[PDB]
Amino acid sequence: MSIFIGQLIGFAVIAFIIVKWVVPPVRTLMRNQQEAVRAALAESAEAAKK
Amino acid sequence: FLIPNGTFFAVLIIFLIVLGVISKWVVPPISKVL
Amino acid sequence: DLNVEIVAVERELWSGPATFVFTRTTAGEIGILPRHIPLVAQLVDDAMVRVEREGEDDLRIAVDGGFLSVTEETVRILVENAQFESEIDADAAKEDAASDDERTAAWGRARLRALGQ
Amino acid sequence: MEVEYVGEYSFEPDPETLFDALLPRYIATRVYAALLEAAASES
Amino acid sequence: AIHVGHHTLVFELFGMTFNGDTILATAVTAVIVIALAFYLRAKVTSTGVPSGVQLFWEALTIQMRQQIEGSIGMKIAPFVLPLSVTIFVFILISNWLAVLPLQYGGGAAAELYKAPASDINFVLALALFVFVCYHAAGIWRRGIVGHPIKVVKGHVAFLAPINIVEELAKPISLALRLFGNIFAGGILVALIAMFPWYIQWFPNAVWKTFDLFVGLIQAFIFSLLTILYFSQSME
Amino acid sequence: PNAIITAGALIGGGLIMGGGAIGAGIGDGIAGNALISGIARQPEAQGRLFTPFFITVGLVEAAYFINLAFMALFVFATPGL
Amino acid sequence: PNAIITAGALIGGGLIMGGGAIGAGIGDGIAGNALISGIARQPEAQGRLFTPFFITVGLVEAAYFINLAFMALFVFATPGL
Amino acid sequence: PNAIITAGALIGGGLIMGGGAIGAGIGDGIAGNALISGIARQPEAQGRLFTPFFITVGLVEAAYFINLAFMALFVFATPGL
Amino acid sequence: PNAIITAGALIGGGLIMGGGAIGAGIGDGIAGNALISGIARQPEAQGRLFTPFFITVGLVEAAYFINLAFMALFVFATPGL
Amino acid sequence: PNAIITAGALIGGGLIMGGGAIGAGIGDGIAGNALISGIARQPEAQGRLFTPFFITVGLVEAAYFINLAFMALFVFATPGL
Amino acid sequence: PNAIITAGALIGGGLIMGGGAIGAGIGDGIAGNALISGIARQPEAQGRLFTPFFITVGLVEAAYFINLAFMALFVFATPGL
Amino acid sequence: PNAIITAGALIGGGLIMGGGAIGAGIGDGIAGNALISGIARQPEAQGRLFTPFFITVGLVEAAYFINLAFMALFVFATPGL
Amino acid sequence: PNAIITAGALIGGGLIMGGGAIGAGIGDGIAGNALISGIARQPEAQGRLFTPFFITVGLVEAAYFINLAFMALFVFATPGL
Amino acid sequence: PNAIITAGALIGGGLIMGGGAIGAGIGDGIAGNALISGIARQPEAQGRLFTPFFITVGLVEAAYFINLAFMALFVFATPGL
Numbered sequence A: 001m002s003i004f005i006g007q008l009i010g011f012a013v014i015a016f017i018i019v020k021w022v023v024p025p026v027r028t029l030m031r032n033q034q035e036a037v038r039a040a041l042a043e044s045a046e047a048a049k050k
Numbered sequence B: 001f002l003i004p005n006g007t008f009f010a011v012l013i014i015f016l017i018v019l020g021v022i023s024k025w026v027v028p029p030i031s032k033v034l
Numbered sequence C: 001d002l003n004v005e006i007v008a009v010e011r012e013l014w015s016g017p018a019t020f021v022f023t024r025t026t027a028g029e030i031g032i033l034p035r036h037i038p039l040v041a042q043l044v045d046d047a048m049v050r051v052e053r054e055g056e057d058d059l060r061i062a063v064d065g066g067f068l069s070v071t072e073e074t075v076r077i078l079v080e081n082a083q084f085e086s087e088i089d090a091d092a093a094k095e096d097a098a099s100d101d102e103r104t105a106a107w108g109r110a111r112l113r114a115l116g117q
Numbered sequence D: 001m002e003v004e005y006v007g008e009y010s011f012e013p014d015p016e017t018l019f020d021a022l023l024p025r026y027i028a029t030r031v032y033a034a035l036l037e038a039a040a041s042e043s
Numbered sequence E: 001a002i003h004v005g006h007h008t009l010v011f012e013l014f015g016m017t018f019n020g021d022t023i024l025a026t027a028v029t030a031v032i033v034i035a036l037a038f039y040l041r042a043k044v045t046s047t048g049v050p051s052g053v054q055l056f057w058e059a060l061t062i063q064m065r066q067q068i069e070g071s072i073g074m075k076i077a078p079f080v081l082p083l084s085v086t087i088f089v090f091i092l093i094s095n096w097l098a099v100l101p102l103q104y105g106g107g108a109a110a111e112l113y114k115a116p117a118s119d120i121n122f123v124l125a126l127a128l129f130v131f132v133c134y135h136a137a138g139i140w141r142r143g144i145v146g147h148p149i150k151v152v153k154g155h156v157a158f159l160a161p162i163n164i165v166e167e168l169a170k171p172i173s174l175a176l177r178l179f180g181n182i183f184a185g186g187i188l189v190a191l192i193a194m195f196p197w198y199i200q201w202f203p204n205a206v207w208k209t210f211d212l213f214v215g216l217i218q219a220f221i222f223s224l225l226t227i228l229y230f231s232q233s234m235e
Numbered sequence F, G, H, I, J, K, L, M, N: 001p002n003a004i005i006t007a008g009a010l011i012g013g014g015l016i017m018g019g020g021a022i023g024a025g026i027g028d029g030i031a032g033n034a035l036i037s038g039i040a041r042q043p044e045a046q047g048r049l050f051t052p053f054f055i056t057v058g059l060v061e062a063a064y065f066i067n068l069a070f071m072a073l074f075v076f077a078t079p080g081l
């Protein structure tokens, strides 16, 4: 059990680290990527309107 | 530890299966969305 | 921030503010941000310059045998003949890129490398 | 050209090659300035 | 004390011995990869905003295509794209799955899921499949007669003995680089298991992050060296 | 017998960490030389130079910690003992 | 007799890893120095330099990890035991 | 038995501090080379160069001091007695 | 008798592999430094620099392989055993 | 027993100071190479460069002298023994 | 007596090959660094550069191969056996 | 017992001098590389370049000579004898 | 007696010859780097860089060959017995 | 007793010579790198650069030759016999 508890606490620490410092950037980079996809997807549509 | 055994095949087949699923339903689709 | 002064031997072409400037000097590709150490570098024969500034789209310049001087405040590009992307005749660039004359071919290649070609 | 020592930076790849490439350019610029000066004087 | 090997679920069939734990870990990572692939298929769209898995797949495919086109265009090697990508995820998911809190005390430390790359069989399977595949590609492009000739010749003819050996080195290293990186880790996290929990928790966090970093780096290096081998064997 | 094996394991772990320390220190110094030179040439590049730096460090430090592992294997879990 | 061979194998594997770690650390530091310098000189190099860089690392790590493999043979499967 | 173990532990610790000193000295010299060069080209860059410096030195010295701690292990708390 | 010879062979093979790894890792890192710098200066150089590079790498790793071969002649086979 | 422990301590201290000497000499040489290159570049900068140069030399010599103190501990106050 | 001499010869040959491989790998990497840098800076000098390169490598490899010659003599002839 | 202690002291002093010689030679070469480069770049600055040079040398050589001093202590005093 | 002396002589000769190999290989590589770079920058200097080069190599080889001689004096002849 | 001291002295002298040779070769290569680079840059600088060069070599080789004398002391007229 002691080994399990120790490795679980380590996993929790690394999970917190990634969620507080690695998740935010990946999240927002993806956010911007998708937002730009959106913008361009649209463009096409509107230029077809023009 | 460094001597291979039957697992060499057992892994390989599985990898090939993955190499199939990706090569058919992932790779071309993503290329096409591209 | 940086203020990019693209000045030709005949006239000054551009003097607006910029955040980043990229160009192919004879020692390789170089990118300059604010407060870059003073530097003097000869641009390659077909060198193109790309300027990134607040808000406006990236500005691509075809430069003929220019020189780049990073200074404490200004990155000055001294050019013999400089052309913005908006002033490029793409077909003329394509035709000139195959010219026998080395200098004319280099200038055509610079115009293309600006044209996005 | 005569070097004038008036009294009291990086270079790529070296200052000697830049000097060699620039002296012809400087002479071209000075000839251009002379021609422009001559045109203004002619007018 | 630490043990090397000692695979669990080991069985025998068709006259061959199989490491049950390694096969199970490989199957788990394979089914996770297949689940990702099928979720993309179920939720892939070009006319709408992409899904998270769609963004991941697009990014990985774009990267692999960028490496391929910069060395050997897909007009010559279009098949190495579906390969280089899978080799990545198959390895990546294989390594990052070892970051889950699946380690416990037997009193010897044990793990429910141990990284497949820590087994020589997994790395050898991947590396020898890559070896055979790009050698077949080289044979196809240069011919069965010309491919060995250009392999021995290499870039410098008189360095022929240093060429052939390197060609035999490519697979081994390609495997041993992956195995040694992960097998070693399997020992470190076991050694950390000798600490008491209140001292054990911090070293596992530090190493686990390295394991994430190094597993990502090793997947990338393995796939990129595969692409480079294809670029070399396909002229 | 265990005394000889323990002495050999201690010497082996000492060699392991000597090599790991040499590699880690010299690699970190070499990477820091590039980092310092780039930040001197390009003061605004610091933020962008940490990613190439911490990746490089992340490699060499890994090679260090792997050694730190196999020392602990030699010293605390001496194989063949 | 086995104790002497075990101590010798431990010392040999320690030498293997000392050399492997020295090589890995120093070569990775040098490659990262090149990467950091190139990215400082031309920022967009970020994109194109990770291909040659991770090749160099791939070459630097190989000699390391192969040694590590031959360490496991020395330590856990001593050839001459 | 204890004498051989202690001699082996002392040799191991000497190897560890020796490698650690090699790594620390060479890495610190390499980093200070960049520091001195950058401050020579840019006299005012000192302020911005001591942060990347002490970072890299912070890594290199770390590799040193870790070894130091473990060497104390080897010599004072020598495992395997 | 054969125990001493086997231990000496293991130590010798460890020395061989440690030296080979140092040489290979450091030489490959040095060559990759030039490769990365050249690609950073000229992205098109990506194409032409792998021929000089992979010649170097191969010559650098020759010494690693020959050494490796003789290590296989030391631990598996053993002169004088 | 002591004679074995004393010989081990002497070998350990020899490694201690050998590594200290290698690190100190090479790091100081690199720092001085930077200082001399900076002063040739800008001969009026001799006064400015002594501060970074002396900081680097202080770090390198701190490593060297801590190692020389640990050799003294090994030889004159051999741990254990 | 022959066992001790054979173990010493094996260790000596291992040292010889380790040093030879260190020198060969590092020197070949250094020479190939110049080759790659020159070919990147002046593409047309490739053939012009392989002459001074293979000369220098030829020197470096010579140092290696002499050492290999001796290693065989150490392990197969073993003077003083 | 002194035989063992004397042999260990001889090995330790040999290590001390080997490390001191490596450090001295490499550091002196590195410093002289800067001296030659500066005197080539600035022929008239020799006087201003030799002072930093002999300082740098005065450091590395010190590390050498200090080691040499302790070698004598190992070789002639043999503190643990 | 002759067995121990011969084993020690073999180990010492291996150290001599391996160190000479490291020095020769690395020095030759470093000198060849300058040779190749100068020839890259100056086609004509090909003729004139062979004089500074072979002098440097002459030094680098000299230290090597001297070691070789002493290595023979260690192994073929035995100063002790 | 004499055999053990003789073997230790041979090993120590071999370490001395290996270190001296590494230092000499690498330092001479580093100094000749600057010499060749300067003479390539400026061909007329030859006569000017032989004074900074032979000084550096004079230092470098000095460290080498000292190691010879002490080696002889270790090898011929071994202290502590």
Ligand SMILES: O=c1c(NCc2ccccn2)c(-c2ccc(N3CCOCC3)cc2)c1=O
Pocket: E154, E155, E156, E162, E163, E166, E169, E170, E173, E174, E225, E228, G058, G059, G062, G063, G066, I024, I054, I055, I057, I058, I059, I061, I064, I065
């Ligand atoms: O990884 C890769 C690796 N070598 C790592 C390694 C393995 C064993 C020992 C030491 N290092 C290579 C590699 C590939 C080709 C090559 N050349 C081809 C052209 O002609 C000369 C030889 C040279 C190297 C990897 O790709």
